[PDB]
Amino acid sequence: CSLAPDYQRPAMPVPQQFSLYQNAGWRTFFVDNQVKTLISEALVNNRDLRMATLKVQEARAQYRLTDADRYPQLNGEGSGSWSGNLKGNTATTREFSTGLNASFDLDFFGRLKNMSEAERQNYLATEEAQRAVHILLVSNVAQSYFNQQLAYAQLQIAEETLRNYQQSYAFVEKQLLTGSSNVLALEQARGVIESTRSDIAKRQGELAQANNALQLLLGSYGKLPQAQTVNSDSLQSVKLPAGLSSQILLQRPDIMEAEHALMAANANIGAARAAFFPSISLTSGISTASSDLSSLFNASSGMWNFIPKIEIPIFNAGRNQANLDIAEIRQQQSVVNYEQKIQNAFKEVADALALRQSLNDQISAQQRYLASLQITLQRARALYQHGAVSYLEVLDAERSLFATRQTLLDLNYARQVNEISLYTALGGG
Amino acid sequence: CSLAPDYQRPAMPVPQQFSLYQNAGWRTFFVDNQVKTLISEALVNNRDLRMATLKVQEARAQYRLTDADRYPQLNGEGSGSWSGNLKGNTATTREFSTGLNASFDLDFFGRLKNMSEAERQNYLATEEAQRAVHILLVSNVAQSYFNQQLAYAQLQIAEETLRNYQQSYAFVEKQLLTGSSNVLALEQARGVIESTRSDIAKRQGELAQANNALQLLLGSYGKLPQAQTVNSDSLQSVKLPAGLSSQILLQRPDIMEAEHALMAANANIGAARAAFFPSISLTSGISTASSDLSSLFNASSGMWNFIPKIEIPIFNAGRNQANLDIAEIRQQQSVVNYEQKIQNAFKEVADALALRQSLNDQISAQQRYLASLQITLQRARALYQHGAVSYLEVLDAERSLFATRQTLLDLNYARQVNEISLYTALGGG
Amino acid sequence: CSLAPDYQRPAMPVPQQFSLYQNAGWRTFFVDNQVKTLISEALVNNRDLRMATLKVQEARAQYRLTDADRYPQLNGEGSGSWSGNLKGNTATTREFSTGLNASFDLDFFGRLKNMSEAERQNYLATEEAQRAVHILLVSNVAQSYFNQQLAYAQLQIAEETLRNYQQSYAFVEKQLLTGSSNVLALEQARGVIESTRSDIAKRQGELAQANNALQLLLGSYGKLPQAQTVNSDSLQSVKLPAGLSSQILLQRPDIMEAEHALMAANANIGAARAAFFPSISLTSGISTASSDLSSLFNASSGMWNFIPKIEIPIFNAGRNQANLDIAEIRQQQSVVNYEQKIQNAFKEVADALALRQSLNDQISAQQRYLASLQITLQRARALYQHGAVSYLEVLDAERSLFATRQTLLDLNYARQVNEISLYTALGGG
Ligand SMILES: CCCCCC(=O)O[C@@H](C)COC(=O)CCCC
């Protein structure tokens, strides 16, 4: 029988709602087929995921190892013994013996049963850990793909901007050969060409970095995607009901992992309690003994045996009690671990929801800012050509425009990352 | 008796002074009452601190478990034995036996005593670890509160700046309807409104983030503080004597933790040394034996027993010596661990003192910069209205002003964080 | 004999080349003598390296501990036994005994041999870990030195820039006292002086930070280097053949560490396999027994003994098989660990090579940008003095110039760091 306490799910340590559903699979969540191809390759070759899988196998074997202690054993033994007096009759006594021994712990109070159940729960927790590694890998690959696509997009506008600046310089140069511009404007036009070449070199380096990070996550080194067209339709951003229960968090593999670890600590309390009670064992066997080897296996030399035994703990100066205290305190730690995983998960979902609002409003404002900067640039150019303002008006407007284009690219990436984090924080596929 | 070496505090591995006192309690250090209310709530509900507390309880129980091995034990045993020949007289021999056994390890050379003292020192080290978690929690809550207050303050000036920009745009619009301004100026005024809306969205997102981080640290989800007025009087920044001894570092809980771990390794050397010496044990008991169950508890079937025993290690191919080497090397590692904690602590205090100077001088300079930018803006506006300069003068001055206001807010926050880190690095309350 | 499988190096989990040699020692790689002096001091006093060294000693002792189990043991035992009936003849029986016992496990199937070989491989892996700590320390000290030198260089140009701004302000002030300038220009000139004072305070703080980080790495607190002249000749940047084999990665200590850990897991499979086979042991000794103490050591009371013994596992409900499964799965994990270290190392080299290209091209572009900005500033000043443009032209050009000088310093530092990381990623000295 078992002395373990019944499992009771701890109270939810977070609010009932995220303020004021089930995730699609990742093959539906991701629309972009290039990112899905990368995800499937990583699932096959990624070494972190492979390690996590092997840890599940190890835990299953550790369970089987512990479960084996519940079953009878059968072992053999053989011995030869020579001995004699150091003085007097110095004649040698010789005896050979043989044993075939069966052994069985009856486990009436469920000590071995619960040590086995603890290890089975560690195995279950380890499968959930593997599932967490799995959904984090999907998330990480996707983010790295959008980072690569960000580098391509930044590189593209850097190169377009370089061409624009070269055309401007050519124009100022022509104007100068007619007294229409001065050497200050020429030099201002000349400088931004060089700063833009620096930006191109930066974005080329970011692309190479993005590629190397991708190959590490994939665990394979074949061709990587070229520049793609990526936008807010590249994923199916999650649509959550207004009054979404935080109970959806309990679906996350990291939370399920903590729950099984808690069930393991419950089983360990059971094993600790059983130490106070008597333990009953049974040994039974066949034996032989003979002073000579030839008649060692003769039935005439043989015996059978059957010995049931009981051990009874009476006073142990608090060994058993300290051991139980440890098991109960570790169970309390497992409860707290479970609460920490839920509070952390709640914070992840809450932050992603707030960042979602943030990024959509920044992106909308930056798009309108960009439109105004385009108009400013066009108006500055007209006024500059007619000698009504200095070339600093054109430079200032050009610089701001290019800066805002880069910022807008970065914000759209952040939005992709956040949509992926939200999906993953809700448990992924 | 004990073979452990006497404890000797390692030499201070850092300078005597921080270049060229006792901390108040945190209820005195913090003036702002809102942050103190948050700290008290976190002390009750924070899960990290609760875990640390449970680890102290576990360590206390592990100590009690190990101490129990020093005391006599009393246990009972019962057995039934059936056996017989496989050939010849196949008649079954039957014997029942009973044992009440006392056991005692005399521990003359202090092996069990020192294994117990090591575990007591682990318990003491674990209490200090709990105290470190405690003062770090106070520090972390306070920093998160000032981060929240920074978000409110950034949001406020972003909204004020938006209003300013809207008033400017309205003015340029009126001027345009009278031929007094041109479409370039109108568009420049229009654009910064949109960039400022992007900043508002950013600061709203930072506020929400700040709030979620706060609730995670608190472990509770009630109302959070609204915007407060926060300044350099919100804490009582520490006043340190010019020639402050680095010996104040030895008060830090992380350093006290390392010291007890070192005392534990000393005890372990004692336990390892005792392995070379004889061990004396004592067993004493009452027993019965009978071929039938009914006379099993008869005094006629009973005996008493008293068996003192000595085991003497002679040659073990260097098992004992390798084990001692391990204990001595681990003690040396504990010394190095202690030195690492002190060198790290010194670096934390030294950095905070340098950052203190840095931030006060940056803040003073930025305040004077801000005053100059205000004047520049006013002068640019006058000149612009009189047609003496382009609207770029107004835009440039407006942009710089808003940027410097944000920087100044960020510097004052950094100063708060640094004052809190210094206080905590000196051991906190 | 041994049942361990032969070691087979896993296939290279990365490409054959880095796209499309041996490192010099660090005393040749580093030219700057100041950084080499710092490296030598850290090698002596750094606490992390000292800890790593002590872990090698501990592992060597653990090996010696495990190896000792392969050798015969000799131990002594002494006993006194008093006993008697609880009823009837209540006369006390007394017996004293003595034992000198030799013991030897023959280890025919290599269980103890392989447990010893596993521990020797852990020792070898630990020496490699120490070597990794060593080359990382060299890298970290060097990077911290160049960070310190960056702070000095940033501080220097900040102070030079302050002087420039003060001279400009003085000039605008003189012009104002003659009606030649207006109060807007005066205030613009005044403001940048104050922003530059903020930058000086920042760079002084960065210098102090750099110094404290350096002393922590050194483990000593003597004088630190003053400002030096540092450039691309300060190190001998590695020159790699076009078709460099990725096999150079297998020289890295972290990879060699993983390989020995894999050899340890191979030995553990051998130990696990031996559990299925019989184990043969031998005990031999001298004993005495006497009812009185005086004749306890008499040869007349003595005996000699010789007892060889065999234990034979037959059925254990899968205990042995689960244990073997665990060893085989852990070996598979060790293979994966080895592959992870190589894939990570490849990524480090690949990134450094890409960053090298990036930084050289950014630095070249920024130098040309700087040259253009100098010319722009000179042209703006001339035009401003002649009343042809506003002072905003001078301010804009001054601000950009100072920003680009700081960026260029930061890029040259990044290049130093990257050259050091590449060298270290290739295995260091
Ligand atoms: C034998 C009828 C009892 C039914 C309850 C139940 O199965 O629990 C068992 C394990 C407890 O008793 C025990 O087995 C006691 C044995 C050692 C003294």
Ligand SMILES: CCCCCC(=O)O[C@@H](C)COC(=O)CCCC
């Ligand atoms: C008996 C008088 C000695 C006083 C010193 C002291 O108390 O230390 C003890 C532990 C060492 O001797 C031992 O107990 C030796 C016992 C095993 C051979």
Ligand SMILES: CCCCCC(=O)O[C@@H](C)COC(=O)CCCC
């Ligand atoms: C005795 C000749 C065999 C040569 C092969 C070799 O040395 O391997 C040994 C270890 C295996 O046999 C064993 O020692 C068997 C002993 C236990 C039943």
